[PDB]
DNA sequence: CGGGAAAATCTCTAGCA
DNA sequence: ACTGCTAGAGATTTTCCCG
DNA sequence: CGGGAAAATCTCTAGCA
DNA sequence: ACTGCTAGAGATTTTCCCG
């Protein structure tokens, strides 16, 4: 409540996003969003071949997290089934395919329509190369190919660590989805309050931002003012 | 008027909507397609 | 430095149970987390809880409402 | 009481009367009637009236099989979150179950699986899988489905959903995936008002973040506490209370009679 | 909300999401999400979380059959007292059951029997017996054993005793009578610390005595009460409260605004 | 507590039992028992014959309440079984038999020993005559004889009312057993307290009688004195 | 005469239940008894109870311990 | 020392007395004639 | 008025199949 | 228009007994 | 500080077979 | 040495909103 001006100065000086502001100055995130205003569901789907069997790989673009299963036939049914599975395990909003015959079937289209996925026809190929490398590294430890494929998916998602932080793809996908959940929660709050108008001290209508226990933060004429709760009236428009 | 949904008799499939004809403590009397039944309230939902 | 870290660690909520009460006690504040035990604080009462009994979340919907 | 006791043992030996009846009829102290009943082997016919509580650590999964329309459905649940992975399988065999489990362990952090003693879960090939993935295997007490109450209730729930959406698929495997989707993302409640997918994300992310934060705090905040004893390692000071760990034993002591060095 | 509602009905039609999920994702008032779920026929899959309570009038008996070692045991319980009469029978037939019931009605005051819908209890010959003895027949809701929870728990208890004393008889009918004896006279507890035999004596004697006493009081204490109405018949005055019976309707009114004539 | 002297006078004047005293003067029954001090479990067992079948009748002597069942053979097994049944339905302390062959069997003796009944080898015959009368009255309403026997047992125990009060045998047996339960309860209380000695005001040991909420009734030198609780000490001897 | 009768009628104990509570409420005093209803008094509170819900005894172990 | 009486595994017949070897919250480990078992505390009685 | 121990009450489970 | 219950085991709270 | 309504919490059940 | 649980329905209590 007091750090609002400090936050405004910091943002004018460094162009900092709402997270770093609501973290360093202890502000409710709707207020930091107002100041700063004053991918996660994207997967790539491609089929690869290896020892005469079809491996249907899905990569989470933001993290490099891999879901691959050996399928029986490069048909539309096996791909629609793989896609329902993926959409039930992770939040999937958009798949990037390559206009192959199976990816364009009416079956996959009905699957995407049921699971609310959007279809859009380079990381996938490098990931196929890494997957094939690990599969060749662990082929002598399984009889069948599907087993070695899952061993490789495991090694890639959890036993290979890279990037800046030194994390693995599972850690990365969990961090990314967590941040994404936060984004939807914040947007839901903003959408919940953005239909209220506040009259304070009476002055003109103000965009409401927060409704704490001891104050009511608002925004009037592109400027943020804190008022005590009893000094203002909140109505829904 | 009320809509009743009920599990009748060993059949694990819920049916309805039926008309509620009578409600007591513990059980209800309903009419599902001219067929009057008596169902324990553990096995009904009245709306 | 350190006090930032501690204030962060105390923002995670904990749901937990006592060894003979089936209901999950509402959100407490996390003070310390070890391998076996979690130290919480529920209504100004500092309980120790075994890890197998504690669900440590963060509630994102609450965090983003203040 | 020596007379009244012997007339009571002779009558219990015939009728096995409860302690109230032998207190009312032979004028006995209730403790003595209870000692009589408590020494009859034939009267010990009842167990405690409690329940245990299942482990709910962040890395424990409960697996079970369930049957529907003649097919076998293997199901896993993440205990802490309620997040499920199901899959229709060809047959309740150890090979298929070991496959399902390798997939799960590659898609999520699985530290411990808990199952009943079905032959597929106890097979030597599910054990080789768990050994490769570094999973700990926990087997229930035999014929105690309450040891797996979470997965067993999830069967209820999965079956309940599959019946709501069965008319939208043709095959059962499709409807099983539809139900896994609906449960993991389209049903909200429990701790935090979440869905199970959001909740597993929160649980796992919280585990990583708290591990990191506490690692840093302990690297920095390095002190020894003497209370009432040895140099107990400090855990948390605040609000006039001190929590320490003396010889791998965690206890809460008030700030009085506790010096920090 | 008109936009958010239609996006919610379209999504429920596919996933059958619960009201919390449609409130969180389409920004809806919980009452509106609940109205959406409440109009989906496919989502009405659960009943109330209560229980009824069985009738416990002094003259109601619950009868059931139970099976042990290949024989049929017919059992009756007096609901108010817990007092049992059991008997091994040749076969679960209406003839045998009508016989058992004539015996019971001649040994005790039986006004009403309550049974499930087993074929022996619903036979036309058990009905002729009940009509001769002036018994009212109450049949449960089919496949609802909870309607007979008293007799069903008595099966538990009878079977439990028969197992304690089975090695003292040779035949099963002997052990059944031994168990009826032990239950009715050698087990104490419940209301009044009684045994079931003492308790049935107390219940029946109390019923007779209270009937007589109240008959006399009403013959003597004859008054009409006007409160707030008609000449309501007085029931009980005392302690500043008046209980009356206006048109077969019993209500408690304070002494104020109530004159006795 | 105050009516003790009135009770003593009434008993010296009319020799009234402890019930009428503890009812008219509102006294705890142990006290009325002390003042007045200063069958129920008896059954008759006989077999009768009728249409070539054996009917085994039991009569409660005090009330005239009848238990009769047609039995298959006048053997010791059927009589031991009838006796176990009776002893499990009613409190049976002593049976009066007639030294017949079945009543003297080792089987009936073992039954009586298990059920704690005492065996002792005119009302039974008059009751057999009344039973036969009712059976002849209701024979046309049943096919078998056992059914008519139970119809007659019913008519006798509940539909025939006689004696002083105008009661039936079922009402009578319930009243008698109720009074008997009261007798055992009182005797149990007397046996529970008769091992205590009270010292009041200190005076010599006194036989304790009651331990109410506001007093302690005792009996010393064949005389009953009420003392307040704090003025006396209760010990167990 | 009549007051003796009434004091007698009020010596019978009543156990009873309310329509959604499974536990039997402890002994109340009986004030009136009809065909359908029993009027009791539990802790200076005059409830009406349906007959099917009331267990009316006298408790003989109590009549005799005072 | 304790005596344990237990219902083991689908057998509805209670056995014992066994020695208690270990008691946890939820279950106990007993020794019945050199045969170590693990029984849920819902299915045991310790004396 | 204070504790200690024992009585009384309360809470909760399996089995009824 | 009908309806879960009962008894034992352990935990927890009340009552009573002597100070 | 007072009610009213809505949110939040609590209590309790079936089914898991 | 391991362990009933989950989600919905209705009832009941809290909280919040404007006075
Ligand atoms: C041959 C494997 C190994 C050995 O035992 C059998 C038999 N069994 C029986 C049930 C069962 O009785 N469910 C009803 C239930 C009752 C109470 C409760 F708390 C939870 C509940 F689920 C199962 O669920 C189950 O998976 C098995 C099984 O797998 N097996
Ligand atoms: C053919 C007759 C007529 C129609 O129905 C069947 C089947 N049935 C089933 C049970 C039973 O499931 N008992 C377990 C139980 C479960 C819950 C509960 F609250 C009480 C309980 F006793 C009985 O007891 C019983 O007598 C019968 C029976 O007689 N019949
Ligand atoms: Mg299983
Ligand atoms: Mg199972
Ligand atoms: Mg039956
Ligand atoms: Mg039954
Ligand atoms: Zn015994
Ligand atoms: Zn629906």
Author numbering:
A (entry chain B), F (entry chain H): 2 to 39, 57 to 139, 149 to 228, 235 to 270
B (entry chain J), H (entry chain D): 222 to 268
C (entry chain C), G (entry chain I): 212 to 277
D (entry chain A), E (entry chain G): 1 to 228, 236 to 268
What does the paper say about this structure?
HIV-1 and other retroviruses integrate a DNA copy of their viral RNA genome into the genome of the host cell, a process that is mediated by the virally encoded enzyme integrase (IN). Each step of DNA integration, up to formation of the integration intermediate, occurs within a series of stable nucleoprotein complexes (intasomes), involving a multimer of IN and a pair of viral DNA ends. Because integration is an essential step in viral replication, intasomes are targeted by an important class of antiretroviral drugs, the IN strand transfer inhibitors (INSTIs). INSTIs work by chelating the two Mg2+ ions, blocking the active site and inhibiting the strand transfer activity of IN.
